Symmetry: C3
Subunit: 303 residues, 3 copies
């Protein structure tokens, strides 16, 4: 029962600074102490210095390819995260990665699935994060990691991302909480038959049924390891106001944590990302910590 | 696939001014552009000038019969709306009427059912809007349109409302979202066996079951056209603060739009009212637009 | 159909003053008038003077046994409440007790079950209120009444509580709404197999199923009288901000009142506490009144 808390203070996936402060804020909130109380032997893993990285992010406007912003810096930092997370998983430790914007998932998902090839990925997000290189409008790479992970628009992915192993398949990723999906993304999810449970489905079936369906969708044998990549903007701005891309109307605070409890309950969680905490906009950070505690086993009654 | 956006800037059904600004605010928010994007060939229909009408509303205190306020002005303006909506439906266009207080529904429901006799009416509201002429306490006619439409308290309805066709029957109207029903209204709903799904039923069965039951209640053959008259005060003041008669605790923003999606889904929507937007109290107007988009086919994933 | 509104202005169960103002605030809000409208012949019962009691509470810091605060004052005041509530029930009247912090339930539960031995108790609360004398950390007795009622940690309950009849058994108490349960309390609920429906269960099954399961848990014959002790902090601080121990994320305003309607519906409610209203922190007091009205029969539609 060992855990590595992977610190990924990266902001180059989106315009706003402050999200790179995520990891330190979560840790100051007592994240590591929380995990130890739940019985986890923890250690911290520093992938890079957030301030040095932020310096290059803020300065280097020339880091563009087409509409895509910072593909070089992002490719470098996410390869670092990949190597770290992969080693953690090979060591037999649980990789709990704290972001940082969601572009870091390019490294975390690649890292985990390289060790666990049949791992399912549950993407908890208001967004699909699957815009292609030529398809993206904002050019913000935190809205693109799944397209790169899936190898979509192959001929337009820059050489600096050549390091990304092709280990994720469309039938191994399930969305929960979608409500701001771009037109291009809509077509992609449809064409690729990706399991997508939007807010419509949560409203229609309830969060318990949705989580069950999401788990089943990425675990046919019912035995597969499961990874969750958790964007805090899935949770309605009423609870998560300090996040870069707030969307209504999202998960309640209750649904957001219940989701974690159902996942913890299934006992097959192998890795977790908690991303897009931007402290410069207590609630957002305490929600991040709460997600961690519930995911890693904290319950309301005796266990 | 043609639509007429019927502008009904009327405020004479209730004391507060500002609700007559509804139509222009929704249009400035981009309502017409939204409908065109969804594939609708649209055009605007101006029934009357809201400023001229508001002038007579604010001045003419003598327009009273008993406790009922502005029965003459209301009867005149709603007859205009009736003739417009009826012609739109006869032209084979979808009447999307923007209010304006809910007294305009006297014209919209009469207009639609005169063309579609077997159309069901789903009344989304915190209130029953079915107080009679002699029964009303406030005397505000936006809380009375269904009594007139149903022909209740026949001997006490003023001659100026003689134009109203008797086309609505009690078994063709279903409420969703009730939580502030007057004692007299309670008795009426009971005595007439009107399908009424209060917040209790939403809490008990969930919004999906409630919407299903409401649709079934007004469509026995499962083939009948369906009209929705949507009062924005059904939605909890937390989401719709700028409305004349706010009531707790109502539909969530999510339930309010999910309702629209289920209706759009059934494919039998023939007309829609969006009423009681009072901008003088972004959320309320954007909610009004959102209701329209979801009702007319906008989905979270690919369609 | 007779009711006694038992006024229990007690604050000695917790540090904060103001909760003793509960009863008067609820009454000024029109609590008694509300009950009369619902058909109840009401009368007020003053157990003690809240100002005189508050005077001794604020002054007497020496009233401690170990970590437990004010065991003497609490034992005295709750014995008074016990004798009052017991007499009310023997008179054949409905005891509706307004607090006051939740330590008053030591008197109300004892009073009711002494007259109705097979009565079930539904404890609506964010907390378990079952910390023992030696187990409590805060030493606040409003978090301890159920341990005393159940006779737990027998050898450490002060002599001043010797008056408490042992009438409550573990299989006759059901929780609804738990989300802040101490580690010691968790073990107790588990060891004693007490029916506990946390926010997890509300999230998982919905409030209707939870209330049904709670009623069944304390009423095997399906005939037993039912008592509800309602802590207003069960309701999310968004609706109940003026309460001493606010916890997220709790019941919605809708769930909180729906709960009351289901209970009223079963027709076996024999007594009700409404506690922990602390006006010095309109919403909180109006919620208290609303709980009362819904519990005692108020419905959204005709009845
Ligand atoms: N996809 C985005 C954001 C990417 C989010 C990255 B994440 O915060 O890590 O999930 C990107 O920058 O690529 C934008 C693109 C433009 N849309 C516009 C929009 C607004 C409202 C609605 Cl309902 C819809 Cl369907 C679309 C918002 C997300
Ligand atoms: N019916 C009303 C409002 C009519 C609303 C028109 B609508 O905004 O278009 O739906 C009218 O003016 O005729 C009043 C009458 C007095 N009641 C008092 C009341 C307050 C709280 C509760 Cl829980 C209940 Cl049951 C009743 C409010 C609505
Ligand atoms: N049990 C309490 C409060 C008793 C409430 C009395 B009531 O307001 O009448 O229900 C007492 O003073 O005895 C405290 C003890 C310390 N816990 C700490 C805590 C905080 C958050 C969580 Cl999630 C958990 Cl599990 C525990 C809070 C309640
Ligand atoms: Mn994301
Ligand atoms: Mn997102
Ligand atoms: Mn209305
Ligand atoms: Mn209304
Ligand atoms: Mn309590
Ligand atoms: Mn409590």
């Amino acid at each position: 029962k060992k855990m590595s808390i992977v610190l990924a203070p990266f902001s180059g996936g989106q315009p706003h600074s402050g999200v790179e402060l995520g990891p330190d804020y979560l840790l100051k909130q007592g994240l590591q102490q929380d995990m130890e109380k739940l019985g986890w032997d923890t250690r911290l893993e520093r992938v890079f210095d957030g301030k040095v990285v932020e310096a290059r992010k803020a300065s280097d406007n020339g880091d563009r390819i087409g509409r895509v912003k910072r593909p070089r810096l992002t490719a470098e930092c996410t390869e670092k995260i990949y190597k770290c997370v992969r080693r953690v998983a090979e060591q037999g430790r649980f990789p709990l990665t704290i972001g940082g914007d969601h572009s870091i998932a390019l490294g975390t998902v690649a890292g985990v699935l390289s060790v666990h090839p049949d791992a399912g990925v549950i993407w908890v997000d208001a967004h699909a994060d699957i815009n292609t290189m030529s398809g993206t409008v904002s050019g913000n790479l935190h809205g693109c990691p799944l397209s790169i992970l899936l190898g979509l628009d192959r001929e337009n992915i820059p050489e600096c991302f050549s390091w990304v192993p092709q280990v994720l398949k469309p039938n191994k990723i399930a969305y929960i909480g979608l409500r701001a999906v771009d037109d291009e993304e809509k077509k992609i999810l449809h064409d690729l038959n990706i399991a997508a449970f939007s807010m419509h489905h949560v409203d229609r079936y309830g969060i318990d049924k949705v989580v069950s369906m999401a788990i089943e969708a990425v675990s046919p044998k019912g035995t597969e390891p499961v990874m969750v990549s958790y964007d805090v903007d899935t949770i309605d701005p009423l609870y998560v106001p300090a996040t870069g891309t707030p969307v209504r109307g999202g998960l309640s605070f209750r649904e957001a944590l219940f989701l974690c409890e159902r996942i913890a309950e299934c006992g097959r969680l192998v890795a977790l990302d908690v991303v897009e905490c931007n402290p410069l906009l207590n609630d957002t950070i305490s929600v991040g910590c709460a997600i961690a505690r519930c995911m890693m086993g904290e319950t309301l009654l005796y266990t």
